From a paper:
The formation of amyloid filaments through templated seeding is believed to underlie the propagation of pathology in most human neurodegenerative diseases. A widely used model system to study this process is to seed amyloid filament formation in cultured cells using human brain extracts. Studying templated seeding in cultured cells, and determining the structures of the resulting filaments, can thus provide insights into the cellular aspects underlying neurodegenerative diseases.
Although the resulting filament structures differed from those of the brain seeds, some degrees of structural templating were observed.
Residue numbers in the entry:
A (entry chain A), B (entry chain B), C (entry chain C): 273 to 274, 306 to 380
Write the structure that this text describes.
């Protein structure tokens, strides 16, 4: 006999923003100091690392809106 | 008998922004200092690394909007 | 008997921005200082690394919008 499986979700969603103006932004942090002392670094299978990092970031996207959706039909997993 | 499997999701999403003007942005951090010391670095299988990094970033996209969507029909994994 | 597997997702999405004007942006960080000292480096199988980097980046795309989509119909993995 018939097996009928229908996966048909409808998506009419909206993610939105309306901004009149995005101002005066001043990213002026005082000068940072980073000091890392080590004797030996020994890395093997799939290790990932950041050592002694000083990052200054000003992002300010004006939208910066995001949508994430995952649709899945699965029989064994 | 029939096996009928139909994967037909319908997507009419919007991800949007309206920004009237994108400002006056001043990324002026004080000068950072990074010091890193080692005797030995020893890296093997599939290591990835960053050592002693000083990064200044001003992004400011005007949109910067994003959609991430995944669609899986799968029988075994 | 009939096995009928149909994969027909419909995408009518939009990822959009409207920005009236993209300002005056001043990326003027103070002069950075990076100092990395090591005696010996030893890298093997599939290693990737960055040592002693000073990066100043001003991006300002005016759109910078992105859509990532992935579609799978799959039977073993």
């Amino acid at each position: 006999g018939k097996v009928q499986i229908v996966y048909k979700p409808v998506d009419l969603s909206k993610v939105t923003s309306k901004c009149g103006s995005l101002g005066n932004i001043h990213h002026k942090p005082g000068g940072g100091q980073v000091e890392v002392k080590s004797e030996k670094l020994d890395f093997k299978d799939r290790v990932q690392s950041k050592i002694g990092s000083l990052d200054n970031i000003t992002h300010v996207p004006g939208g910066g809106n995001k949508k994430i959706e995952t649709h899945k039909l699965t029989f064994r997993e």
